[PDB]
Each structure stands twice: as structure tokens, then as C-alpha cells.
Amino acid sequence: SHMDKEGFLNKVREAVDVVKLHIELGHTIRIISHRDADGITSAAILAKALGREGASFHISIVKQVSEDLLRELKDEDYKIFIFSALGSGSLSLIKEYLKEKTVIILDHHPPENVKLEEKHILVNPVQFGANSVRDLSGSGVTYFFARELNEKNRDLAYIAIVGAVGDMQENDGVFHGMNLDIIEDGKSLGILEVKKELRLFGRETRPLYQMLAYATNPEIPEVTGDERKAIEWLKNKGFNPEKKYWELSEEEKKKLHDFLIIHMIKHGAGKEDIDRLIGDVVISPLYPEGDPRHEAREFATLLNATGRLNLGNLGVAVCLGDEEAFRKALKMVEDYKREQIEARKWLLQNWNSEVWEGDHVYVLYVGKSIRDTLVGIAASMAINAGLADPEKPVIVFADTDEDPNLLKGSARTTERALAKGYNLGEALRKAAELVNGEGGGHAIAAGIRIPRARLAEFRKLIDKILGEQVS
Numbered sequence: 122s123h124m125d126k127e128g129f130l131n132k133v134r135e136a137v138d139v140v141k142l143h144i145e146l147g148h149t150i151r152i153i154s155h156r157d158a159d160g161i162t163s164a165a166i167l168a169k170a171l172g173r174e175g176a177s178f179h180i181s182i183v184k185q186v187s188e189d190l191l192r193e194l195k196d197e198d199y200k201i202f203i204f205s206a207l208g209s210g211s212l213s214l215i216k217e218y219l220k221e222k223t224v225i226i227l228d229h230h231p232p233e234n235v236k237l238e239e240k241h242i243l244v245n246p247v248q249f250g251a252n253s254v255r256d257l258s259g260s261g262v263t264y265f266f267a268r269e270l271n272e273k274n275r276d277l278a279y280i281a282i283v284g285a286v287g288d289m290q291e292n293d294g295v296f297h298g299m300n301l302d303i304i305e306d307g308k309s310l311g312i313l314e315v316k317k318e319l320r321l322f323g324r325e326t327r328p329l330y331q332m333l334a335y336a337t338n339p340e341i342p343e344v345t346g347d348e349r350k351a352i353e354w355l356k357n358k359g360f361n362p363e364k365k366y367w368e369l370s371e372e373e374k375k376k377l378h379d380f381l382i383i384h385m386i387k388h389g390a391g392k393e394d395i396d397r398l399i400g401d402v403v404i405s406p407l408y409p410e411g412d413p414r415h416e417a418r419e420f421a422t423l424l425n426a427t428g429r430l431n432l433g434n435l436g437v438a439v440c441l442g443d444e445e446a447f448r449k450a451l452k453m454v455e456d457y458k459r460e461q462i463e464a465r466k467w468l469l470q471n472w473n474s475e476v477w478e479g480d481h482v483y484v485l486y487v488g489k490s491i492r493d494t495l496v497g498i499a500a501s502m503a504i505n506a507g508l509a510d511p512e513k514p515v516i517v518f519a520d521t522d523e524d525p526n527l528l529k530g531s532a533r534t535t536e537r538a539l540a541k542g543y544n545l546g547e548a549l550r551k552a553a554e555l556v557n558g559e560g561g562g563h564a565i566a567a568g569i570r571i572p573r574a575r576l577a578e579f580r581k582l583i584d585k586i587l588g589e590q591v592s
């Protein structure tokens with residue numbers, strides 16, 4: 122991909138001029154953001170930037186943009202609404218319910234192909250040639266929005282990268298697009314640094330054997346999910362398994378990298394998984410070593426842990442420096458990682474007996490066996506554990522926490538399937554229209570909410586829609 126970076130920044134300037142019209146008049150800025158790391162960092166960037174301009178703001182951290190949400194926002198008396206890290210897939214609904222309000226969309230998902238009214242400004246790098254999952258995240262769009270508003274907001278560069286890491290925008294091992302420009306801004310201020318290290322969770326707070334056993338993207342053969350074998354392997358290679366990765370010297374890290382690469386080669390791992398095991402890791406000298414805020418992936422996991430318990434507002438406070446909010450949030454990470462471990466064990470046990478395999482898709486309905494906010498991780502795990510054909514997309518459904526008759530689904534696939542022509546966001550958007558649902562997202566990763574009554578109909582429908590995308 123090749124962005125028109127200046128054309129995108131010109132659009133950012135247009136949105137900044139609009140929001141300053143309302144700041145001048147003392148209008149309270151209504152902010153709607155997503156509950157994962159990309160949305161939480163986005164909300165904190167807006168909260169800090171708008172605080173620097175003396176503006177007032179009201180933040181709501183939500184699970185998605187829905188028609189039910191927009192009907193609630195229609196009755197709110199705010200003059201301007203800012204959607205961050207979401208909203209691109211709901212332009213028609215935003216046009217309908219917020220017609221007489223000013224709306225700013227700071228997002229990176231493929232936008233719905235509809236025209237907007239003059240007071241609804243879409244700020245999306247995809248419209249300027251960006252790859253939606255590599256070149257910039259929602260926190261990155263919000264960062265450049267904040268930077269154009271005030272140059273001092275460059276000190277939010279690390280927070281913006283935390284959201285990009287939460288969105289796995291360095292999933293192939295390196296950063297791309299305007300994420301590299303954010304990194305340069307943070308390096309100029311000395312608030313972040315890019316290392317070439319093991320790209321796994323647990324650099325700061327986990328012992329080495331849990332860092333290896335937790336690895337699911339990519340998995341480490343025979344070691345993933347088995348802390349006892351991880352301990353044996355580390356000791357056999359001359360490492361203290363209880364030591365943390367940050368406590369290793371640079372010489373020991375390189376020795377660990379060599380052993381892991383040899384291990385994956387000996388067990389037949391693919392080249393793409395080997396090449397992304399070691400790569401860009403962003404750390405921040407603003408925080409001490411051993412603190413999860415010191416590394417972007419641990420920081421993002423910490424924020425996701427707060428949003429998992431409907432406490433994303435606590436995660437926003439952590440980004441803004443609330444140390445008491447940090448002390449609470451730190452106690453939420455362990456149960457978050459444990460639930461992912463149990464989710465993988467449930468997948469390995471029940472995939473064969475429960476999965477619905479069509480000609481172009483896997484559809485797995487877990488009921489409540491996996492939390493609805495974890496179906497995206499579950500779908501990726503099925504691919505990364507070898508349960509699913511890499512060229513066949515995986516959709517995992519779970520009952521929503523709020524409505525047992527409503528399902529939340531996440532679709533995930535690989536680059537090999539994208540080469541076949543599959544586009545999960547486009548397919549889910551079309552299928553949702555036919556079963557009274559709401560769906561959309563990236564070509565490689567998308568989500569959908571449908572009534573539980575429509576599950577059997579949806580499986581036949583999405584299999585047909587995906588099959589027609591095949592080039």
C-alpha cells in the first residue's frame with residue numbers, strides 16, 4: 122500500500138477546524154470510543170488533547186456502534202459527536218440518527234460506501250490509499266488529529282502506538298505506514314524506543330516460561346499451552362525459567378532468539394510465523410522496567426483487561442496517569458490471560474464435534490463457553506493452532522452478554538485466503554443486511570451481530586456470499 126499522507130493530513134486539518142468551532146462556543150464534546158486498546162487509547166488522546174484546549178468532553182466507552190446506540194445519542198442534546206476507533210461501518214445510520222448534529226469520525230476500518238452530509242466529517246486513512254490493518258489504527262488517526270490541534274500532543278505518541286499494537290498492526294513483525302511517523306515523533310521526544318525482540322506478551326511482568334506458554338501468534342510448537350514443557354525447554358537451553366525477559370541481557374536475548382528459531386524450524390513451522398516471532402517491540406522510558414506500561418503489548422493487554430470487565434473508563438484513566446486506576450487495573454490482567462488459556466483448551470476439545478464447515482467458511486457457535494469479547498481471539502487461535510485450513514475463514518459466535526437471543530461473531534482469516542479474494546468485512550456487511558443484523562470490518566478481520574434465531578440461515582448465507590468473492 123502507498124498512502125497519500127499529506128492528503129490525509131489535509132482531511133485531518135478540516136476536522137480540526139470543525140471541532141475548534143465548537144470548542145470556541147464552549148460546546149461539550151461527546152466522545153464515543155471502543156472498549157479495546159485502540160479505542161481506549163483513542164479516548165485518552167482526545168481527553169488529553171481537548172483538555173489542553175480547555176474544552177469539556179463526555180466519553181462513553183462502548184462495545185460497538187449500533188442502531189440502538191445511535192437512537193440513544195439522537196436524544197442527547199450535544200452539538201458535536203466524535204467517534205474514535207469505530208463508526209466507519211455505520212455511516213448510513215449516523216447520517217440517519219445524527220442528521221442535525223456535527224459528527225467527526227476518527228477511524229481506520231473500511232468505510233461504508235455512502236455519501237455524507239456537510240456536517241459529518243470522516244477522517245479515515247483508507248480513503249487515502251492506506252491498508253486498514255497495517256498503515257494506521259484508530260489511535261493513530263486520533264493522534265494526528267490531536268497533533269494538528271496542538272503540537273504539544275506529540276507526547277501522546279507512545280499511547281497511540283499502544284493502540285496500534287493492540288490492533289496488531291505489527292503482526293507481520295514490523296510497523297508500516299504512518300505508524301512509522303508516530304514512532305519518529307515519539308523518538309524525537311525520547312518517550313519511546315523500538316527494539317528487535319521476541320514479539321510475545323510478558324516482556325515486563327511474566328516469567329519466561331509463561332511468555333513461551335502464552336504464545337499463540339505465532340504458537341511455539343509443543344511449548345504453547347504447556348508451562349511444564351516450557352520450563353523444561355528453557356532449562357535445557359540454559360535459561361532461568363522464572364526470570365523475566367526484560368531481566369535478560371542483550372546477549373542472552375539473542376541466544377534465546379537463536380534457539381527459538383532453530384526450534385521452530387526443527388518442528389516444521391512456516392516461514393511467515395518464523396519471520397514474525399522476532400521483530401519490532403516498542404518500549405517507553407517514561408515507565409519503569411517490570412511495569413506493564415513499559416512495553417506497548419503489555420500496556421495494551423492491561424487496557425483490554427479493563428474493558429473486558431466494562432471498566433474501559435478505568436483504562437482511559439490509566440493512560441492519563443491515574444496511578445490509583447493503574448493499581449486497580451493491574452489486578453485484572455491475570456484473570457484476562459487465564460480466560461484466554463481456557464478458551465484455547467475449549468477450542469481444542471470441541472472444535473471437531475461442534476464446528477460447522479461449509480465450502481468457504483468455518484462457523485463455530487460456542488454459546489457461553491467463550492466470552493463474547495473473546496470470539497475474535499478464539500477465531501485467530503483456531504487458525505494459529507492448526508485447527509482450521511488457513512485458506513478457509515473462521516467465524517466464532519457467542520451469545521452476547523446483554524441479550525441471550527443476540528449473537529456476537531468475529532471473523533478471522535489469513536493472507537493466503539485474502540489472495541483467494543475473500544473480504545470478511547464486505548461479506549459480513551452483506552449477510553447482516555439479510556438477517557436483520559449489523560456487521561463489517563476489515564478484509565482479514567471483521568465482526569457481526571445477528572439474532573440467534575438466524576444462525577442456521579446465516580451459515581448457509583455467509584458460505585454463499587464468501588464463495589462469490591472467490592477470484
Ligand SMILES: [Cl-]
Nearest residue numbers: 497531567568
Ligand atoms: Cl470484531
Ligand SMILES: [Zn+2]
Nearest residue numbers: 123124125126
Ligand atoms: Zn507518493
Ligand SMILES: [Zn+2]
Nearest residue numbers: 206230288562
Ligand atoms: Zn477494529
Ligand SMILES: [Zn+2]
Nearest residue numbers: 159258259288
Ligand atoms: Zn482499530
Ligand SMILES: [Zn+2]
Nearest residue numbers: 295296297298
Ligand atoms: Zn511497510
